[PDB]
Amino acid sequence: GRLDLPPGFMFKVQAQHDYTATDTDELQLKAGDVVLVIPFQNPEEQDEGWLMGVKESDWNQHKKLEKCRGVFPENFTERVP
């Protein structure tokens, strides 16, 4: 996939449910998905219980992550050590 990693990135997470998100910049998660926790552009754009993360596949497009950026409920996902 990508050659470089996203700056500010935190870690990889694993969804535990299928949350269909349909927005202009939402993050669709599927029960058993892989998403990376990254620092959004601002916390004022983040919701309560939802953070800015990108899917594993999207990572491959890290080249244009700026267009892969999305949001997802952390309480609906799990942290991957």
In order, the DSSP letters of 23-77 are: SSS---B-SS-EEEE---S-GGG--TTEEEEEEHHHHHTGGGGGGT-EEEEGGGE
Q: How far apart are CA 41 and CA 52, in angstroms?
A: 9
User: Can you give the residue ranges of every domain in the chain?
Assistant: 1-81
Q: How far apart are CA 57 and CA 62, in angstroms?
A: 9
Please name every residue paired with 51 in a beta bridge, in sequence order, or none if there are none. 72
In order, the DSSP letters of 39-50 are: --S-GGG--TTE
**Terminal C-alpha separation, the chain:** 21
Fold of 1-81: SH3 type barrels. (2.30.30)
Place of tokens 């309560």: 48
